[PDB]
Nucleic acid binder design. Structure first.
Length: 76
DNA sequence: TCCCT
């Protein structure tokens, strides 16, 4: 397998529905097509940013992070 | 529009 590293990313809340998708079909298919793991801290209030924690091999984080930013493309 | 480990 590949090295196991931890990374954290924050996204503007206005995109939370855009990157997460309804029912999670977006965040879920992403973790299935890439096989990466994703944990999100409880939503932040008083802030317009959510915290996403990624955990998997660099390939999974690499394949996963590219998919996260790509989603931010459609909301715009 | 909303979800996950």
């Amino acid at each position: 397998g590949g090295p196991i590293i931890t990374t954290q990313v924050t996204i503007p809340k206005d995109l939370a529905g855009s990157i997460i998708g309804k029912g999670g079909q977006r965040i879920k298919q992403i973790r299935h097509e890439s096989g990466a793991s994703i944990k999100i801290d409880e939503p932040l209030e008083g802030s317009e940013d959510r915290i996403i924690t990624i955990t998997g091999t660099q390939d999974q984080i690499q394949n996963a992070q590219y998919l996260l930013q790509n989603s931010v493309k459609q909301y715009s």
